[PDB]
Design a protein around this ligand. Structure first.
Ligand SMILES: Nc1ncnc2c1ncn2[C@@H]1O[C@H](COP(=O)(O)OP(=O)(O)NP(=O)(O)O)[C@@H](O)[C@@H]1O
Length: 524
């Protein structure tokens, strides 16, 4: 402990090595609960509790030989840490030279020196299975890559209309423990990140008890194994010092960056509740290294600035990412106050969970008019090249229809529906199908809980093709009443529950031909 200094010092750090996975920590990486700390533009203090166990024995597979040149981030061994995650043992940033000594394959505790590096000036550096890093300094990397690859969530509304990029920043309302919603949990378990760092914060009541003995019971749907085996929990209970809680997102993101550095995609999910900043009191009369108006607003930007997909340190070309999903729960839930405005200025994605959607049981209750993603153009080429060349045209078309529907519903609120032309009735019919057959998704269903990219575009094609055929039929004298009761419509309403994508795809031809029947019946 201690060893303290001037600046932003006291050396506030985290340990990084086998046994971060499955751990539950507080805001400064102690293995359970309660001790009181005090924060400042200067230092902070603690006392007793060991982050990574020194007694446990880890299997070390060497990945480098005596005589190898190494740089920061180079991978010198592998440690099978859970049944899901292989831990990658890396040279700490700043250390380079020749490997003069390295442990043979065997079992070792984390304090055992598993390698030695002779630096260029001849200093001999001793390497263990873990390393320490100041939580307040971003771990370094070679290059931060532009947003490009979507974080695939398997949730249609998000992946299609409001995509998250790997390395992106997203915000979502309210506490993660809210029982009104389940997308928080869908995101945690289905996103294609190998590792999840979860800061179960804003915890009061059952929030720290049911989060305790369900996560070990929780299953990783991709592997049957427990979700905890690829997760690190960081607790922010109400009985914790406001300084360890503050520091928790920094400890979390440092641990995220650490798994990023191995070549992993990692998702960092940060919880939040009500009224953190009444402890505020431009205006800074007595300042130091904390010029405190909305200085915190600039510091939040800085945290979110640590998200990204990067070419990592190391001598191999290696990419990893940290994508950030932050909860936003305003003081009164009025979404005008600081917490929301300060977050919404930095994040590139907002998923507007909407109490009115939930109340009418439209699930995922994501408002498709107030949500937005600034990654749509960033990710489109990945969809075009890998999944479907018409991904972006199709989403834009479906969105235009959602927007037309919304304009039409306003007008109909004023004058009612009796004067609606067939064409506008047809737009309402197909928008309703989009809403019900595509946006709505069943998280509780064994099929519809996850929707693969290939299934998403096929379902979209079935719907947009039905749109085209509807408008061309209207355009040919076929009454809307006849289209509304086309037998294929009910198969379209059920396609989300079909796991065979070729059967979903067959609905295109089946739509086409049923419409032909109408075209000939009405001699149209
Ligand atoms: N089958 C399902 N598939 C996906 N999500 C579901 C499903 N069933 C329920 N949900 C979730 O239910 C949520 C409704 O949230 P909503 O109540 O609108 O949030 P809110 O009340 O505005 N604030 P909060 O609940 O505190 O975050 C949606 O985010 C999710 O869809």
């Amino acid at each position: 402990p201690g060893e303290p200094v001037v600046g932003t010092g006291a050396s506030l750090s985290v340990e990084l090595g086998p046994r971060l996975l499955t751990s539950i920590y507080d805001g400064i990486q102690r293995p359970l609960e309660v001790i009181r700390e005090k924060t400042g533009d200067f230092i902070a203090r603690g006392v007793t509790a060991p982050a990574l166990p020194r007694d446990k024995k880890w299997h070390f597979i060497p990945k480098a030989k005596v005589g190898d040149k190494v740089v920061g981030g180079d991978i010198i061994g592998e440690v099978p840490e859970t049944s899901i995650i292989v831990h990658k043992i890396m040279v700490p940033p700043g250390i380079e030279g020749e490997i003069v000594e390295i442990a043979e394959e065997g079992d070792y505790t984390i304090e055992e020196v598993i390698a030695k590096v002779k630096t260029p000036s001849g200093e001999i550096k001793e390497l263990k299975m873990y390393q320490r890093w100041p939580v307040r300094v971003k771990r370094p990397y070679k290059e931060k890559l532009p947003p490009e690859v979507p974080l695939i969530t398997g949730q249609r509304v998000i992946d299609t209309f409001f995509p998250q990029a790997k390395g992106g920043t997203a915000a979502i309302p309210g506490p993660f423990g809210s029982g009104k919603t389940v997308t928080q949990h869908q995101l945690a378990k289905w996103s294609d990140a190998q590792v999840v760092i979860y800061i179960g914060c804003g915890e009061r009541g059952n929030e720290m008890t049911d989060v305790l003995e369900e996560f070990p019971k929780l299953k990783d749907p991709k592997t049957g194994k427990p979700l905890m085996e690829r997760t690190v929990l960081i607790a922010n209970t109400s009985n914790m010092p406001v300084a360890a809680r503050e520091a928790s997102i920094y400890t979390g993101i440092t641990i995220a960056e650490y798994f990023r550095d191995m070549g992993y995609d990692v998702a960092l999910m940060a919880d939040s509740t009500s009224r953190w900043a009444e402890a505020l009191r431009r205006l800074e009369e007595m300042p130091g290294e904390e010029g405190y108006p909305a200085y915190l607003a600039s510091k939040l930007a800085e945290f979110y600035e640590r998200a990204g997909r990067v070419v990592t340190l190391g001598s191999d070309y290696r990419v990893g990412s940290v994508s950030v999903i932050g909860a936003v729960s305003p003081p009164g839930g009025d979404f005008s106050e600081p917490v929301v405005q300060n977050t919404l200025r930095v994040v590139k994605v907002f998923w507007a969970l909407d109490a009115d959607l939930a109340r009418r049981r439209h699930f995922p209750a994501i408002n498709w008019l107030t949500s937005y993603s600034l990654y749509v153009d960033a990710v489109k080429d990945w969809w075009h090249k890998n999944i479907d060349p018409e991904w972006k045209a199709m989403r834009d078309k479906a969105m235009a229809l959602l927007q037309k529907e919304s304009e039409l519903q306003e007008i109909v609120r004023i004058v009612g529906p009796d004067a609606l032309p067939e064409r506008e009735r047809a737009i309402l019919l197909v928008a309703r199908m989009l809403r019900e057959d595509y946006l709505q998704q069943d998280a509780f269903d064994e099929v519809d809980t996850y929707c693969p990219p290939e299934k998403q575009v096929t379902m979209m094609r079935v719907l947009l093709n039905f749109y085209d055929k509807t408008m061309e039929a209207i355009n040919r004298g076929v009454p809307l009443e006849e289209i509304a009761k086309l037998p294929v419509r009910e198969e379209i309403g059920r396609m989300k529950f079909e796991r065979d994508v070729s059967k979903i795809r067959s609905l295109i031809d089946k739509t086409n031909e049923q419409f032909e029947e109408l075209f000939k019946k009405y001699g149209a």
